[PDB]
Design a protein around this ligand. Structure first.
Ligand SMILES: Nc1ncnc2c1ncn2[C@@H]1O[C@H](COP(=O)(O)OP(=O)(O)OP(O)(O)=S)[C@@H](O)[C@H]1O
Ligand SMILES: Nc1ncnc2c1ncn2[C@@H]1O[C@H](COP(=O)(O)OP(=O)(O)OP(O)(O)=S)[C@@H](O)[C@H]1O
Ligand SMILES: [Mg+2]
Ligand SMILES: [Mg+2]
Lengths: 581, 18
């Protein structure tokens, strides 16, 4: 019994068990249930991280300390180590000798109680050929007799799926619900546990710091329950303060330190803005304008929304931004979104929405229901967001997607989280949701009847309203209608494409010089308001790339070439001069 | 009006007689 089980009462005397703070209803229920018959044995079914082990182990510490009833004052508590019992069960009858011997000691004393943590495991523990014995069966007669009382703890899922299956054990055991405590109750627990953590790390936590940990952790960390989640910040905060300075100049834990620790655990960019990061944020609009010309309203909306999140003036349970980009073909809707990720140095979660045209395909985003071939792979959207909490979610061609797709996004915009088939929740608070749409684009290129063409921008918005539900538009932070590229804007676009060509030529050792007159000629030939910037690329391909390709493959530009481009005013045709150099 | 159609072995341990 020395190795099979451990004496929790003795452990508390040496300080092994941590101090028990709170949970007075659970302790009261456990003690009263133990003394009475008719399911004397209490159970501690609760969710993970809710302190189930602390209630059973904290009871032994309380009994040795005092302030317990006389009947329970002398009741010693032991914990069953299932691994120890099976360590030496090589030969037949070893388990019987160990389990029966242990039960005899507990039963004969009549005041010893065994606390079997994770009691779901003992239901089995043996399937060897011939024996046909189990730990639960060995103790089933004793529990039915009621001579021996045993405490237990199990997860809610395990109790319903494992403990509930064995009606005999479930019938005897008395369930005691355990749930996450209140915010006030949790900070009190940390104060009670503050001497232990402070001693190990040689740090001191301020009253505000413990309060901040509970509020900040619950706000940003959702998967874990409140007791362990809040304590995880305290333990990590002490370690960081202890380990960060080699000189040990800073021993106390400031509130600012708690914020930084919570940020890394929850992978949120929200923190005090750094000088290096601050500079980049200021020039985000300027850099975006250099790459994407025009569409200033779109850039302003993205930059201002992102700035608010770092400043802290952001939606509590919604994404930083939910922008719908609708415009004519060829305008830089996708480019600004793609370039935004590069400028901000964050991953681009580009999800083409043409593939999700069918209703059944939407399950792919949130995962296939359990029990199918594709359940294991999981959702593509939730997994991507979990892997990259701070990222740009570019849902291009959202119009093509099935109406069911929009339903999923409605929850993300307001609730701020989406649950997959597995049940994990993805945090979209730091995700920049930009959905490009081509709705009402035919009207944009439609030429109205009459001498003077009419502005069909209003007609396009009506089509967008028809395709998108009113509730969907209300949730969106802003709807930006991209304007048609002007002649001045197109001139900048031509230069940008030439720069891309120059970079490609640099790889081959060729340098391209385009005169100002040549650039104007290219712009006029390819400038179409309806088609957009894309025709400019086609003009560059035929006029510039095609001649260079022949020379590059077979000609003067094969190695270390040079190029000059000028516009023949008399012939109104470009002249390409190649020097072998 | 299209319709979409949606679509034992364990190791054991031996104990020698004591
Ligand atoms: N009411 C409480 N009073 C004091 N300390 C607590 C309390 N609840 C939790 N703690 C502390 O926080 C820890 C939480 O983890 P445990 O209680 O050990 O986990 P557990 O209940 O065994 O976990 P599962 O997931 O349910 S098996 C405890 O061990 C204590 O250190
Ligand atoms: N406003 C712009 N400024 C600079 N380059 C642009 C601009 N708009 C388009 N381009 C160029 O066109 C390409 C980017 O096109 P995208 O923005 O991806 O098109 P899009 O908005 O997805 O198109 P549709 O027709 O609206 S689906 C790159 O070659 C860009 O350099
Ligand atoms: Mg436990
Ligand atoms: Mg697009």
């Amino acid at each position: 019994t020395e190795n099979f089980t451990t004496n929790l009462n003795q452990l508390a005397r040496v300080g092994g068990i941590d101090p028990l703070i709170g949970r007075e209803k659970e302790l009261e229920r456990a003690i009263q249930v133990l003394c009475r018959r008719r399911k004397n044995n209490p159970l501690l079914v609760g969710e993970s991280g809710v302190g189930k082990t602390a209630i059973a182990e904290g009871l032994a510490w309380r009994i040795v300390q005092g302030d317990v009833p006389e009947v329970m004052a002398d009741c010693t508590i032991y914990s069953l180590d299932i691994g120890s019992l099976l360590a030496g069960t090589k030969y037949r009858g070893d388990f019987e000798k160990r389990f029966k011997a242990l039960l005899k000691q507990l039963e004969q004393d009549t005041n010893s109680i065994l606390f079997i943590d994770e009691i779901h495991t003992i239901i089995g523990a043996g399937a060897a050929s011939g024996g046909q014995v189990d730990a639960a069966n060995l103790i089933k007669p004793l529990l039915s007799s009621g001579k021996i009382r045993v405490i237990g703890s199990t997860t809610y899922q395990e109790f319903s799926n494992i403990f509930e299956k064995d009606r005999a054990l479930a019938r005897r055991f008395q369930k005691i619900d355990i749930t996450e405590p209140s915010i006030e109750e949790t900070v009190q627990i940390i104060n009670g546990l503050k001497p232990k953590y402070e001693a190990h790390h040689d740090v001191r936590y301020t009253a505000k710091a413990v309060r901040a940990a509970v509020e900040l952790a619950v706000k940003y960390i959702n998967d874990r329950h409140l007791p362990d989640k809040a304590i995880d910040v305290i333990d990590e905060a002490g370690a960081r303060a202890r380990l960060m300075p080699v000189s040990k100049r800073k021993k106390t834990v400031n509130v600012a330190d708690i914020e930084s620790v919570v940020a890394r655990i929850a992978r949120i960019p929200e923190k005090s803005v750094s000088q290096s990061d601050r500079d980049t944020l200021k020039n985000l609009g300027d850099r975006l304008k250099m790459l994407v010309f025009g569409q200033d309203k779109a850039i302003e909306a993205l930059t201002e929304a992102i700035k608010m999140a770092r400043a802290g003036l952001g939606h509590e349970h919604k994404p930083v931004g939910s922008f719908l980009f609708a415009g004519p073909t060829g305008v830089g809707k996708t480019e600004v979104t793609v370039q935004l990720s590069k400028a901000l140095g964050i991953e681009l979660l580009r999800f083409d929405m043409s593939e999700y045209m069918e209703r059944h395909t939407v399950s792919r985003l949130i995962g296939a229901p359990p029990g199918y071939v594709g359940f294991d792979q999981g959702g593509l959207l939730t997994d991507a967001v979990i892997k990259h909490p701070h990222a740009v979610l570019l849902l291009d061609e959202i119009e093509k997607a099935h109406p069911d797709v929009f339903n999923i996004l409605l929850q993300v915009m307001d609730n701020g989280t989406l649950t997959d088939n597995n049940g994990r929740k993805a945090d979209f608070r730091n995700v920049v949701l930009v959905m490009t749409t081509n709705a009402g684009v035919r009207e944009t290129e439609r030429k109205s009847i009459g001498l003077i063409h009419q502005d069909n921008s209003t007609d396009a918005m009506e089509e967008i309203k028809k395709i998108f539900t009113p509730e969907f538009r209300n949730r969106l932070d802003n709807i930006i209608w991209f304007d048609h590229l002007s002649t001045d804007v197109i001139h900048q676009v031509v230069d940008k494409f030439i720069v891309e060509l120059q970079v490609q030529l640099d790889q081959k050792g060729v340098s391209l010089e385009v005169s100002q007159e040549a650039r104007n000629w290219l712009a006029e030939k390819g400038y179409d308001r309806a088609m957009g910037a894309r025709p400019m690329a086609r003009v560059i391909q035929d006029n510039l790339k095609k001649p260079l390709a022949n020379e590059l493959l077979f000609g003067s530009l094969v190695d270390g070439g040079q190029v000059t481009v000028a516009l023949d005013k008399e012939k109104n045709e470009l002249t390409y001069g190649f020097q072998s150099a | 009006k299209t319709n979409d159609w949606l679509d034992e072995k364990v190791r054991d341990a031996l104990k020698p007689p004591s």
